[PDB]
């Protein structure tokens, strides 16, 4: 993480935090790991079959069976490169509505961090739709993460619909939270590690 490379897999859920958010350091155990309780893995092609007369569109799993979108999905990084616009048109609104939660299994990845003032509200999806439109079959961009700038005073704080966070603790290069200040109030209490 000191070399801007993060380990572990990736998560895209809907999360509207009134308070603190930490994509690099998840506070709880990650949901829906591979092979978990009714967690479904997309096969090689990344293929969606349309269904007639108001039925939900079905997604072909790893076992070549069409499964419904609303649930818990797993994406190999190679599958996401061949199925960009099929991700972005069908299963990504079901992440935005919160009716499904996808995992993006990629081993190690360069990460770019976005920092925002938690006074003004923010929606992570236009920052993260931009990450999706730049995915080629060749390669993927460095993954964006909107991290709230930790404040020194306990302010009223807007909600943010956050989407992207990771599995393993990749907050290994942080080293401070409010250095010149006296005490952090809103954000993480990341003092200098002895």
């Amino acid at each position: 993480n000191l070399f801007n490379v993060a380990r572990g897999n990736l998560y895209l859920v809907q999360t509207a935090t009134n308070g603190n958010w930490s994509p690099m350091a998840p506070v709880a155990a990650p949901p829906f790991v591979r092979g978990g309780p009714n967690v479904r893995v997309v096969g090689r092609f990344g293929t969606i079959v349309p269904r007639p007369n108001g039925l939900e569109p079905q997604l072909i799993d790893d076992g070549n069976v069409p499964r419904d979108i609303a649930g818990d999905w797993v994406y190999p990084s190679d599958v996401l490169q061949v199925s960009v616009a099929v991700f972005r048109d069908y299963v990504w609104p079901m992440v935005k509505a919160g009716r499904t939660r996808v995992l993006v299994e990629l081993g190690h990845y360069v990460y770019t961090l976005h920092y925002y003032d938690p006074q003004i509200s923010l929606d992570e999806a236009p920052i993260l739709e931009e990450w999706l439109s730049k995915i080629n079959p060749a390669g993927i961009p460095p993954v964006p993460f909107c991290i709230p700038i930790p404040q020194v005073y306990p302010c009223i704080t807007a909600r943010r619909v956050h989407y992207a966070f990771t599995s393993e603790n990749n907050n290994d290069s942080l080293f401070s939270t409010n250095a010149a200040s006296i005490d952090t109030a809103f954000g993480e209490n990341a003092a200098v590690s002895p």
Binding site: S83, V84, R88, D89, K96, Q119, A158, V161
Partner: protein, 84 residues
């Protein structure tokens, strides 16, 4: 409508930037042009495909292949006039 910064900003779920087709995925910039494709098409053999990796439309060669050249005493075979 009171413009305050502490106000939960939510992006639209479906995309108005890409109104996808109902019976296809022929995208456009305006859904008014999309209402005439379904009025004409979804009501030859292979007219087109749509690729998920490059987002282009790959079309068949034209049925007027007589203008295409024939190489070394071998003619381009076309489909017979079955449906009359």
């Amino acid at each position: 409508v009171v413009s305050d910064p502490q106000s939960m900003k939510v992006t639209p779920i479906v995309n108005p930037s890409s109104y996808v087709c109902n019976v296809c995925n022929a995208r456009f910039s305006t859904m008014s042009a999309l209402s005439e494709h379904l009025r004409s098409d979804h009501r030859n053999a292979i007219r087109s495909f749509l690729t998920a990796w490059d987002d282009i439309r790959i079309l068949s060669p034209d049925v007027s292949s007589k203008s295409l050249s024939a190489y070394l005493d071998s003619a381009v075979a076309n489909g017979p006039e079955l449906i009359i």
